[PDB]
Amino acid sequence: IVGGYTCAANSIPYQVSLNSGSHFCGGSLINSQWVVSAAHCYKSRIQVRLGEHNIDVLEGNEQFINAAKIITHPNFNGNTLDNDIMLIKLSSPATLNSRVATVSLPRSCAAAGTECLISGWGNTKGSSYPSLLQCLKAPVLSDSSCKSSYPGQITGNMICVGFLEGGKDSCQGDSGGPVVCNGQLQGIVSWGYGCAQKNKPGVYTKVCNYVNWIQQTIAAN
Amino acid sequence: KPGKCPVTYGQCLMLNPPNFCEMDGQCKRDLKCCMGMCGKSCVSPVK
Ligand SMILES: [Ca+2]
């Protein structure tokens, strides 16, 4: 997160870290046993870390739970990043206290201008990862804006969230993390051209298109 | 292999994206090993 602020400790209880030796992606806890992330964050072995604030210091609050299964969207295109969504089943459920909670799926897609919270442990510039969870308030942008910034590359499954002036954006290491608007998961950190560049807002998987796929996939697993 | 890697424009927001190949010889048929939006993979060459 470039241009954001350090979150209050544990104020984003649905935010997870995906770890396979170190943090590499974010994720969103949507029920006690299921995390939603980006398909491009796929690894054959993942440990999910819940309750985190300082990813580099055990603060007591953490749950460390391995992934038992990992299901990428069947139509994921690794070359265009269309359908950039995956689900992770925890090998045992997380305990839901005040420091680990679920986030709701959307009831519908967010209107342009809806104000959202984006979070993660990605770079805050060069690099590198901050220790403490970062936070950034940002609005959904019109499809029109999104496609002027990235002509030909925005599918029906992508939304742009942020500022066209730049300065404020998700960055490398925020991949797979949440965009939450009026208490609903609306975006998954996916891609962009650099970070915080002018007319290059972040591109996000449009989670509202996947509500049924999420429920169906969970139902079958 | 003959041809160029395609021009790309975004990058996935992962620091160390996955590489599914290191050289063209690891790619079937006329496919090249190219950095894309998210790491290296076998893709069709351009002109
Ligand atoms: Ca910690």
Residue numbers in the entry:
A (entry chain A): 16 to 34, 37 to 67, 69 to 125, 127 to 130, 132 to 145, 148 to 183, 184A, 184 to 187, ...
B (entry chain B): 60 to 106
Please give sentences taken from the publication describing this entry:
SLPI (secretory leukocyte protease inhibitor) is a 107-residue protease inhibitor which inhibits various serine proteases, including elastase, cathepsin G, chymotrypsin and trypsin. The exact physiological function of SLPI has not been elucidated, but its major role is considered to be the protection of the airway epithelial surface from attached human neutrophil elastase which has been found in pulmonary lavage fluid and sputum from patients with inflammatory respiratory diseases. 1/2SLPI (recombinant C-terminal domain of SLPI Arg58–Ala107) has a potent inhibitory activity against multiple serine proteases such as trypsin, chymotrypsin, elastase, chymase and cathepsin G as that of intact SLPI. Generally, a main part of the affinity and inhibitory activity of the biological inhibitors depends on the P1 residue which penetrates deeply into the S1 pocket of the proteases.
The present work describes the first X-ray structure analyses of 1/2SLPI with P1 Leu residue with trypsin (PPT) at 2.0 Å and comparisons are made with the previously reported 1/2SLPI–HNE and SLPI–chymotrypsin complex structures. Two complexes (one with chains A and B, the other with chains C and D) appear to interact with the reversible inhibition mechanism. Additionally, one uncomplexed PPT molecule (chain E) exists per asymmetric unit. Two independent 1/2SLPI molecules are superposing each other at the corresponding main-chain (Lys60i–Lys106i) atoms and the root-mean-square difference (RMSD) is 0.19 Å. The RMSD value among three independent PPT molecules was 0.35 Å by superposing with the corresponding main-chain atoms between residues Ile16 and Asn245. In all complex structures (1/2SLPI–PPT, 1/2SLPI–HNE and SLPI–chymotrypsin), the Leu72i residue of 1/2SLPI is located in the S1 pocket as a P1 residue. The primary binding region appears to range from P3 Gln70i to P2′ Leu74i by intermolecular hydrogen bonds. In the 1/2SLPI–PPT complex, the S5 pocket of PPT formed by residues Tyr217 and Lys224 interacts with the P5 Tyr68i residue of 1/2SLPI. As the enzymes have not drastically changed the structure of the S5 site by 1/2SLPI binding, 1/2SLPI should change the P5 Tyr68i conformation to accommodate each S5 pocket. 1/2SLPI controls the inhibitory activity by using moieties from P2′ to P5 and can be adapted to various proteases flexibly.
